[PDB]
Design a protein around this ligand. Structure first.
Ligand code: FHP
Length: 516
């Protein structure tokens, strides 16, 4: 099905007059907000509420040091702000930042059984912050095992009679928790549907949030235009008609990985790769034959334009674009002297292709492997080790050691990959089946364990839940690499929720600005 979108993004000229206006006022609001953070004698609840709000407004990327030093101090002082609301929020904010605060802070809210006091069922703000906190738990937090089911049933009961915009904030949290949501997507919802309508809102912060979001959106629009032209200069809708034309969606994905302005070059490179590999996926799935695919897989392994002649004409266009894309990457990084790290992304792409081939081999043969074998292959075909490696290309700070760490398949990356795999398979267990795909994810699980379709999807969900707990542990200090390089992996898992349907998000993020 083609693109709802058209040439709607090919053209975009940033009215520099308006951009400079926004920037100038932002710089002022930025210092005002900074001073708010550096405020002396603030109660704990207030300081947490301030940090939470600046994060939800999507402007916390300006105060990384300030917010860190404040949470560090809160971590080390271990003061007991005894209410549920302040505790849960304190827990969440610290854990999201890597501080391993003990979960025994939730003991005072539980009876002799490790279960939450049913008497807290009437504290809505407390239930909400507990709910949000329940999604950042690791394997060592069994104390919170019932926190999610507890806060959920009561939030659902109380929701209908709450005042706005709290009613809306609660209904939305029950459909999408903050921790696992895409940053920009949650920021857009918070600013306009909640905070803007909040009676006690801080005008300086709302103004700041609206201006910043709109100004960065200008940058995203420029990037998407640049990328839309690049995509038309390839004429893949014309020279190679079988693939999906989802360059806007691919941009959304890159945008979900990181939205900050400093990751502009990074976002652009990443979109090109996501769009490129989407074609290779389309080739192996709905086009190429057993012989052609084998030639394609081999050509990719060699990685030399000379092998092009062994490939039929259509695959020649794909193959050349791919090699040229990586040549551009090498060229873009030539300046800093990081052109060289590009091979890491290439090695991951070859791996994706190998497993693509293996996947079609299993389909032809009618092979239903055991879950163990299925995953040893099906994990790379999610393309996540590949996109994750690609996301480091544009990050000027990425060193060789960061790529080295990533190539060893760290548990946090492994977890992110599993989430996409398991979610995709649960989502594609019935459709894929009628297209006669035999080595489906869940069938392998069904024939391997002796469980039904229901039990197999249920077991896959636990795999995803386990994976989230692993991602959360992966964030805890000391981190194997700087947090800057863990966030892209976390975001890749977030995008999964968000996707497993994109039109609304694209409109809210790339079409409509936030009306002031
Ligand atoms: C335009 C969009 C949605 C881009 C990002 C979405 C994405 C990561 C899709 C992966 C497709 C896969 C894994 C194909 C494999 O060849 P296989 O069919 O073997 O799983």
């Amino acid at each position: 099905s083609p693109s709802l979108w058209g040439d709607q993004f090919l053209s975009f000229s940033i009215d520099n007059q308006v951009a400079e206006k926004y920037a100038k006022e932002i710089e002022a609001l930025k210092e005002q907000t900074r001073n708010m953070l550096l405020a002396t004698g603030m109660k704990l609840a207030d300081t947490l509420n301030l940090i939470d709000t600046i994060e939800r407004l999507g402007i916390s990327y300006h105060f990384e040091k300030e917010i860190d030093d404040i949470l560090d101090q809160i971590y080390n002082q271990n003061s007991n702000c005894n209410d549920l609301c302040t505790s849960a929020l304190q827990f969440r904010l610290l854990r999201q930042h890597g501080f391993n605060i003990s979960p025994e802070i939730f003991s005072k809210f539980q009876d002799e059984n490790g279960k939450f006091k049913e008497s807290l069922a009437s504290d809505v703000l407390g239930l909400l912050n507990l709910y949000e906190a329940s999604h950042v738990r690791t394997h060592a937090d069994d104390i919170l095992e019932d926190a999610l089911a507890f806060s959920t049933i009561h939030l659902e009961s109380a929701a209908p009679h709450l005042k706005s915009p709290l009613r809306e904030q609660v209904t939305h949290a029950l459909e999408q928790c903050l921790h696992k949501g895409v940053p920009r997507v949650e920021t857009r919802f918070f600013i306009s549907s909640i905070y803007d309508k909040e009676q006690s809102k801080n005008n300086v912060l709302l103004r700041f949030a609206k201006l910043d979001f709109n100004l960065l959106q200008m940058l995203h629009k420029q990037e998407l235009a640049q990328v839309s032209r690049w995509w038309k200069d390839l004429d893949f809708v014309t020279t190679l008609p079988y693939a999906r034309d989802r360059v806007v969606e691919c941009y959304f994905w890159a945008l979900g990985v990181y939205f900050e302005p400093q990751y502009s070059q990074a976002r652009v490179m990443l979109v090109k790769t996501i769009s490129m590999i989407s074609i290779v996926d389309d080739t192996f799935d709905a086009y190429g034959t057993v012989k052609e695919l084998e030639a394609y897989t081999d050509a990719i392994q060699r990685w030399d334009i000379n092998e092009i002649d062994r490939l039929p004409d259509y695959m020649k266009i794909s193959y050349k674009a791919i090699l040229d894309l990586y040549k551009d990457y090498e060229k873009e990084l030539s300046s800093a002297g990081r052109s060289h790290i590009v091979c890491h992304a290439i090695e991951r792409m070859k791996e994706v292709v190998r497993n693509y081939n293996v996947e079609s081999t299993w389909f032809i043969e009618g092979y239903t492997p055991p879950v163990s074998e299925y995953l040893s292959n099906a994990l790379a075909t999610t393309t996540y080790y590949y996109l994750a490696t690609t996301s480091y290309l544009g990050m000027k700070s990425a060193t060789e050691q960061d790529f080295e760490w990533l190539s060893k398949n760290p548990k946090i990356l492994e977890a992110s990959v599993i989430i996409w795999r398991v979610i995709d398979d649960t989502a594609t267990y019935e459709v894929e089946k009628s297209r006669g795909q035999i080595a489906t994810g869940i069938e392998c699980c069904m024939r391997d364990y002796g469980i039904s379709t229901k039990e197999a999807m249920a077991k896959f969900q636990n795999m995803a839940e386990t994976a989230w707990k692993d991602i959360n542990e992966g964030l805890l200090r000391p981190t194997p690499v700087s947090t800057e390089f863990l966030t892209p992996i976390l975001n890749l898992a977030r995008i999964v929720e968000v996707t497993y349907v994109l039109k609304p998000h694209i409109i809210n993020l790339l079409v409509d600005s936030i009306k002031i």
